[PDB]
Design a protein around this nucleic acid. Structure first.
Ligand SMILES: CSC[C@H]1O[C@@H](n2cnc3c(N)ncnc32)[C@H](O)[C@@H]1O
Length: 332
RNA sequence: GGGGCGGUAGCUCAGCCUGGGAGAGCACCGGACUGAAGAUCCGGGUGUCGGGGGUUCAAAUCCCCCCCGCCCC
């Protein structure tokens, strides 16, 4: 926290060089006079290193909203070490906190609010469980509500995390499959949830896509999503309500199939039966099993009488030594 | 044509009032971690601030023009 001096016709080069040294303090604004210009600096030693005229002076604090605050920066090392990563969905700020941190948590909510001032609700985060794959959350601050529209990849998505499942992080995957699609194709997505996958797909390609859901409330929300992104989508989507295993025999075949399988569930055979060109099957695999997992996929392809090449990518970290992964049936 | 707003990383966005650090979260990539975990830990910015001009020693920030998306005549 300090500073330096420079003639008005020279100030720029001083700024750029002092920025090369990184000594230029940024948490304070700089005073300008017709005579000279005065800049703040972090360490005066390196300032006399370059010999630039350096007078210790009082320069004004920058507005808070202009300073590069950070979650690490805004918290003590202990409470930061305890707290888990921050995930924002609409205006809901979701964060893992242990109890010991929960006692000292008001500092936490202060830090979150500082980092983002539009987050109207803040909730402690638990684990996924149950048929509907919902996540456990008990609000720590704000309006006692867990439903919002959430902008992602040019798409709007309403959610009530209390009654439905959604995870923003796999948007990358949701984008990645989207550009892998081709226009005019026919794709089926079981275990849709709301429609993050076929919405983000429909936005980017002109495609008919059918979705399957048991969670009736997730069907309600998906129905709501269809209007907003119906104005916004090139493609068209059909939402069928029911169990994947009844619907899949009773529905025709599709070019592509994308199965975000619930954990502990096997739908590889059933999905491979309906897909014509490619299938994307998501499962949870331990690192050693990945290759073996590929073998498994291949085995099913042989039973299906389908000659196809398969590859597998590590979609995300599920647990210690365990990743959520995806397989890409490429049928000939 | 007119005006009201928006165009910053891959997504969602701060920053602009009042000129001087390209940032946040997640994404993405590489590494690590044995019981439950749609996690967690370590490292990395991947950028034509829509474009051009003007002003100033200096523009993401102030001015004009052009392009593109929502809303009003
Ligand atoms: C990762 S989200 C998995 C989604 O699939 C839905 N789901 C789980 N099992 C089935 C099933 N048999 N049929 C249709 N949807 C399902 C759940 O409601 C959840 O939202």
């Amino acid at each position: 926290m300090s500073g330096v001096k420079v003639r008005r016709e020279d100030a720029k080069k001083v700024l750029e060089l002092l920025k090369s040294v990184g000594i230029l303090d940024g948490k304070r604004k700089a005073i300008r006079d017709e005579k000279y210009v005065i800049f703040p600096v972090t360490d005066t030693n390196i300032a006399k290193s370059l010999g630039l005229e350096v007078v210790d002076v009082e320069l004004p604090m920058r507005p808070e909203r202009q300073i590069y605050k950070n979650l690490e920066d805004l918290l003590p090392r202990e409470i930061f070490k305890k707290l888990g990563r921050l995930d924002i969905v609409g205006d809901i700020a979701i964060v893992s906190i242990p109890d010991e941190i929960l006692s000292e948590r008001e500092v936490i909510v202060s830090a979150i609010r500082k980092l983002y001032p539009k987050v109207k609700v803040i909730a402690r985060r638990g684990f996924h469980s149950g048929l509907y794959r919902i996540r456990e959350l008990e609000v720590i601050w704000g309006e006692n509500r867990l439903h919002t529209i959430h902008k992602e990849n040019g798409v709007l998505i309403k959610v009530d995390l209390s009654k439905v499942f959604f995870n923003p992080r796999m948007k990358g995957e949701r984008y990645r499959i989207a550009q892998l699609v081709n226009d005019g194709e026919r794709i089926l997505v079981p275990f849709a949830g709301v429609i993050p996958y076929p919405l983000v797909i429909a936005r980017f390609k002109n495609v008919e896509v059918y979705a399957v859901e048991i969670n009736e409330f997730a069907v309600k929300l998906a129905e709501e999503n269809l209007e907003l992104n119906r104005d916004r989508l090139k493609g068209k989507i059909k939402i069928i309500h029911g169990d994947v295993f009844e619907v899949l025999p009773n529905l025709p075949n599709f070019d592509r199939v994308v199965s975000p399988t619930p954990k502990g569930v096997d739908a590889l055979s059933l999905t491979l039966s309906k897909a014509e060109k490619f299938l994307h099957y998501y499962d949870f695999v331990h690192e050693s099993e990945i290759e073996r997992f590929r073998e498994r996929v291949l085995e099913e392809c042989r039973r299906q009488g389908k000659e196809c090449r398969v590859s597998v990518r590590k979609v995300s970290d599920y647990k210690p030594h365990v990743y959520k992964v995806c397989a890409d049936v490429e049928i000939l």
